[PDB]
A paper describes a structure:
The protein N is a multifunctional protein that packs the genomic RNA and enhances the efficiency of virus transcription and assembly. The SARS-CoV-2 NCTD folds into a helical core with a protruding β-hairpin employed for protein dimerization. Here we report the crystal structure of the C-terminal domain (NCTD) in open and closed conformations and in complex with guanine triphosphate, GTP.
The crystal asymmetric unit contains two homodimers of NCTD with almost identical conformation (rmsd 0.14 Å). In striking contrast to the previously described structures, the superposition of the subunits in our structure shows a ≈5.5 Å movement of the β-hairpin. The alternative conformation of the β-hairpin is associated with the structural displacement of the loop between α1 and α2 (residues 280–283). In the closed conformation the β-hairpin interacts with the C-terminal proline residue (P364) of a symmetry-related protein. This interdimeric interaction between W330 and P364 through a π–π stacking (face-to-face rings interaction), and making hydrogen bonds with T325 and S327, is a common feature with seven NCTD structures determined previously. But strikingly, our structure shows that in the open conformation, the side chain of the residue W330 is rotated 180° towards the β-hairpin making hydrophobic contacts with the side chain of the residues T325 and S327. Therefore, our structure shows that upon a side-chain arrangement the β-hairpin changes from an open conformation to a closed conformation that might favor the interdimeric interaction.
Author numbering:
A (entry chain A): 256 to 364
B (entry chain C): 254 to 364
The structure:
Amino acid sequence: KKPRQKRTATKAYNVTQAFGRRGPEQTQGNFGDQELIRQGTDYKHWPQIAQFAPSASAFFGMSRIGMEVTPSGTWLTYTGAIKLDDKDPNFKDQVILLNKHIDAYKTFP
Amino acid sequence: ASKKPRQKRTATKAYNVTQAFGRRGPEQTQGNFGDQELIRQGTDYKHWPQIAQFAPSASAFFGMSRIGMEVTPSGTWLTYTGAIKLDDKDPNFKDQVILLNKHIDAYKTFP
């Protein structure tokens, strides 16, 4: 039922079904290995990924936001960067986990 | 409120958008969203719910976005880009668009 931005992926409604196939196009998402894509927020290390996701206030606070109002459709666009905390004892594990999921689709069979 | 990682911060009247997220401005990775009133008020802005409806859930942030990782002299950064489609068949559509435009780059019109 829900607008795309408010969906929560799970094993019953997975990342592909919720957000489309992972791929190279500007309008496709590129994040997730095979296990994350199948499990969504059921994934065993989801809480470690979700720690980087913005609050509603931070999404509107930190990002560069645009509006593309066209004859074909309107899109709110967003871009930004979130600094990892070097001095967090889990930093090395975070780097590893993010490395596993970013562009992982490139290697799928 | 200020204890939290930046991306989990919640701006309010007591801890405002400038305080939590820095001054609005034109540079990449500097925020550009908010007029004087939203800036002061954060999530106490009367019309915050009509804005927040466009913010993504954590699953959708990682599901919809293009994500990168960049290692620079300033540290390690998780970068992101994406776009959320408005429902142009919703009777509230033009209201929504007016509300978003009112805040996008508002900072250009004041010191």
